[PDB]
């Protein structure tokens, strides 16, 4: 009944998802937006919402009375979900309709309102009918169809029937009738060819039941209509198979040159709409009634007609000349129009205005930037559009249409908000006027030659920088002349050996001065000395390697919480790390949010006051989810939440500068959504985890009594003996602590395998973490903190095969069995020479130990009789071809079975 992350906004919708008209008087209209379905009232200026699906919403149809709305989603696990318009918080559902079926790719509901009928996405498609007025949760009747008909993606119900449906693909059309007393659904899908008319007919789009005659209509891209008649069992057939009603292609006629694709029929008119901005109404004779045409309007994909049957004024009225021999009054319902290019309009029934509504991004979507002091947010498409909203007002305001065919993706404000900037996929960069979106530079800057991938301003307005997908950096600077500021190019440099993952500006308050910082996938981090940089010479002076076995993804300033200062970075290991504002060395190991995928990007909520200085919050997105974190991080699951959005992928972040709201832009969903947050709900969730070790104990299997936990605790004592030495004549003594050299031993002893580099990292972490407060190195570590280190450093589950497989797959040939495999001497030599080096005698000792040729423990009694045996054992123990299967049989008696999650918050 309350949530941390609630949704209520939609910007944009996919124009291929057909609109309907519901409540007329107030103007409230229905559109689908990714996995969500939405109602919006123009005059109240408020949205109403239908709450999600397991996948993107695939298809919908509204009852004729606009009381009922039905919807489906694509992908697995699909649900068919039906709704009452005027409760506005309704429910109805069909569970589990199809196991494999990838959601229902077309679906109609009876105007009769008794039945629902559906077409599944599947390699062979399903047809099923559903008595939705009953709480039925299984198909009443079923058929599956040859592939030859193709994707079937239009379906309609017959207003003159209860047991007839039509469907077509691009390339086949189908008639259906359901014999419920027989329990049989029958189909026919006859094949058209040129022979029927010796004429071109080509591809066709939609099919519909005629107004009054035993007929089925099909509309063509060819400018033509096709019509069929149905034939029903002749009486002599009734004694036999009574071959279910057959469809015959009586007639073809050409109605216009231009492509038609829309067809719907209203109150004994037919209505047809075109690729190029002409919409026509007809009487069942196919007689011509006055059309609507040539507005700034095209490829009309959404037609819909009002619930209101028109009352009839005639004393003063505006009606058009019908084209009858006389030409009479003509009064449609009100009706809705919308284009291909996502342009939404309502018509006054009397024609006196063609009124347009919201207008929205055509195609694919990329993430939005907020003004830092004003309730303004800027949205941009790939195509031709950047536009700004006041997200409190929900009002569409200033926008500029951009030059044709340039792709655009990156957007930024400068820290003042006075400037806006955008990045264009064809080698192109603009600076923009945070008012008029004038091209500030008389020409844009077009120095690079492929897609941007980041842009950012310095704290100084005078400097801006971008990344490009060629892994090349570029920087931008202001020059002061004549009392003017002008913007000017600054010089490119290639500094990353893999895809760039973040780009950042930095301040030297130490000198009130600007800094430039870049995150690559190459595990390398760099800073550039702007103040020494010069033309054709970005001054590169600092490279760090910052990840291992993995790669980083995001870079931001950590907020000030400390004397020290940090950058925050995240990696494919689900790890987060802090690096030092001077040395960029590491000391923090964190476990990222468990939620399904690694973090893609994070942004930090703004500060008003000391009250925020007392309480800081971090926002992040992953592949498919958006989530919140309270600082400091410690990997506690209760400390974090994440929620699912546009679940074919999310691609950027933006935050309301008041600190109330966040906005997510998807991609192919063409949709942007606002999110409204309760922090106290997360404080409550934190309280669910309790305090002290309780969360971390909960992370250990069996917590404080699990046999694992006791097994670990012994190693603390055993390693304490090792630190004392096994041989001593004194009293034994132990207390609270192990000495850091033992810590790698204990960590391995539990079952996690840090590299030498990881060891160095952890020793740095322990030494330095206390350092700045104490002034001191410290080297006695206590169990509770060691446990925290393990829990952060460990693989985010049990140890996994996957990296082993990947390593063999890189190193090995595919063998006779194709298995990725390594030859024994090559394998040995590589293990000595490469990676981290091994001494030959060291490696031989290791193998002899693993095979168990030595005496055990290697820590009290001598051995040297053994080692000569291992020389021959290197041949005799190791097979000539080695594989992950063999190597894991040698290393592992542990069957490292797979983890599970579903209960975890």
């Amino acid at each position: 009944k309350v949530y941390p992350l609630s949704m209520t906004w939609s910007f944009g919708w996919n124009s291929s998802l057909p609109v309907y008209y519901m409540r007329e008087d107030r103007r409230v209209i229905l559109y689908t937006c990714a996995h969500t379905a939405i109602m919006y009232d123009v005059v109240r200026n408020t949205q109403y919402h239908l709450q999600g699906h397991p996948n993107i919403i695939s298809c919908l149809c509204v009852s004729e009375d606009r009381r009922w709305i039905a919807t489906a989603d694509e992908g697995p696990d699909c649900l068919i979900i039906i709704w009452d318009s005027f409760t506005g918080i309704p429910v109805h559902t069909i569970f589990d309709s199809c196991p494999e079926g990838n959601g229902m790719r077309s679906i109609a509901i009876t105007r009769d309102s008794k039945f629902l009928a559906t077409i599944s996405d599947s390699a062979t498609q399903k047809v099923c009918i559903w008595k939705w007025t009953l709480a039925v949760e299984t198909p009443a009747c079923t058929l599956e169809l040859p592939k030859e008909y193709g994707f079937q993606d239009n379906l309609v119900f017959n207003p003159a029937n209860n047991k007839e449906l039509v469907s077509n693909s691009k390339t086949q059309a189908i008639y259906y009738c359901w014999f419920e007393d027989k329990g049989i659904l029958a189909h026919s899908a006859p094949v058209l060819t040129e022979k029927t008319f010796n004429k071109l007919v080509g591809k066709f789009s939609q099919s519909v039941f005629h107004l009054k005659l035993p007929q089925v209509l099909s509309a063509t891209k060819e400018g033509k209509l096709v019509v069929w008649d149905i034939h029903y069992p002749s009486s002599t057939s009734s004694s036999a198979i009574s071959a279910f009603p057959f469809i015959k292609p009586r007639k073809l006629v050409h109605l216009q040159k231009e492509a038609i694709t829309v067809l719907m029929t209203i109150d004994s008119y037919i209505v047809t709409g075109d690729i190029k901005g002409n919409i026509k109404f007809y009487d069942h004779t196919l007689s011509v009634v006055n059309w609507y045409s040539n507005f700034k309007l095209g490829a009309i994909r959404t037609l819909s007609f009002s619930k209101t049957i028109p009352s009839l004024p005639t004393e003063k009225s505006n009606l058009p000349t019908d084209c009858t021999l006389r030409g009479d009054l003509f009064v449609v319902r009100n009706f809705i129009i919308g284009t291909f290019d996502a342009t939404v309009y309502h018509m006054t029934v009397d024609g006196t205005k063609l009124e347009k509504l919201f207008v929205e991004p055509r195609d694919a979507v990329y993430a939005v930037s907020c003004h830092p002091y004003q309730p303004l947010i800027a949205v941009g498409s790939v195509c031709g559009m950047i536009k700004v909203w006041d997200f409190e007002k929900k009002v569409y305001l200033f926008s500029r249409t951009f030059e044709k065919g340039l792709g655009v993706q990156c957007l930024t404000y400068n820290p003042e908000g006075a400037l806006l900037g955008a990045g264009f996929t064809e080698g192109t960069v603009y600076i923009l006027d945070a008012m008029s979106l004038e091209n500030e530079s008389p020409e844009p800057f077009k120095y690079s030659k492929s897609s941007v991938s980041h842009c950012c301003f310095s704290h100084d307005s005078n400097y801006m920088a971008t990344a490009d997908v060629n892994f090349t950096v570029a920087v931008y600077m202001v020059v002061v002349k004549n009392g003017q500021r002008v913007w000017e190019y600054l010089a490119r440099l290639r500094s990353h050996q893999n895809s760039i993952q973040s780009l950042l500006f930095g301040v030297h308050l130490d000198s009130n001065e600007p800094r430039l910082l870049s995150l690559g996938k190459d595990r390398f981090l760099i800073e550039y000395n702007l103040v020494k940089s010069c033309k054709d010479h970005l001054d590169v002076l600092d490279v760090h390697r910052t990840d291992q076995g993995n790669y980083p993804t995001c870079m931001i300033w950590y907020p000030p919480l400390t004397k020290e200062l940090f950058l925050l970075i995240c990696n494919s290991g689900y790890k987060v790390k802090l690096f030092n504002a001077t040395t960029k060395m590491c000391r923090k190991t964190l476990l990222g949010p468990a939620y399904g995928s690694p973090i893609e990007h994070a942004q930090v909520l703004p500060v008003k006051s000391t009250l925020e200085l007392q309480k800081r919050y971090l926002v992040f997105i992953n592949k498919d989810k958006v989530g919140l974190q309270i600082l400091p991080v410690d990997g506690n699951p209760h400390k974090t939440c994440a929620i699912v959005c546009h679940p074919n992928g999310v691609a950027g972040m933006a935050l309301s500068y008041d600190g109330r709201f966040a906005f997510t832009a998807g991609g192919q969903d063409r949709s942007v959504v606002q999110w409204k947050i309760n922090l106290g709900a997360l404080e409550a969730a934190v309280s669910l985890g309790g305090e002290d070790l309780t969360p971390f104990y909960g992370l250990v299997s069996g917590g404080r009594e699990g046999k694992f936990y006791r097994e670990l605790e012994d190693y603390f004592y055993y390693s304490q003996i090792r630190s004392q030495g096994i041989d001593t004549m004194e009293t034994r003594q132990v207390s609270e602590h192990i000495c850091l050299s033992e810590l790698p031993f204990v960590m391995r002893a539990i079952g996690f395998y840090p590299s030498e580099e990881k060891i160095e990292d952890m020793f740095n972490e322990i030494k330095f973490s206390e350092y700045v407060e104490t002034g001191k190195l410290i080297d006695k570590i206590n169990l509770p903190d060691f446990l925290k280190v393990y829990l952060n450093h460990r693989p985010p589950f049990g140890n996994t095969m996957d990296g082993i497989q990947n390593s063999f797959n890189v190193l090995g040939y595919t063998n006779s069995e194709g298995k990725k495999a390594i030859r024994r001497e090559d394998f040995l030599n590589l293990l000595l020479t490469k990676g981290e080096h091994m001494t030959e005698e060291e490696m031989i000792d290791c193998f002899s130990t693993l095979f168990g040729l030595t005496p055990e423990g290697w820590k009290s009694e001598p051995a040297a009789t053994c080692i000569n045996g291992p020389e021959i054992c290197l041949q005799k123990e190791l097979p000539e071809e080695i594989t992950a299967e063999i190597f894991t049989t040698e290393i592992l008696g542990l069957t490292l079975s797979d983890s599970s999650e579903q209960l975890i918050q």
Partner: protein, 46 residues
């Protein structure tokens, strides 16, 4: 789980005590069908 080398130590620790009464062992083997067929083989070799 991770306990291989212990097998070797135990393997040597395994005791060595012999067949407690060898005549019994011999007599049992003489009733073995395979041995009886071996004696038949010895008849065939003649």
């Amino acid at each position: 789980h991770t306990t291989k080398a212990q097998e070797r130590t135990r393997k040597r620790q395994q005791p060595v005590k012999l067949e407690p009464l060898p005549v019994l062992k011999v007599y049992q083997d003489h009733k073995q069908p395979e041995y009886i067929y071996e004696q038949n083989r010895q008849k065939l070799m003649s």
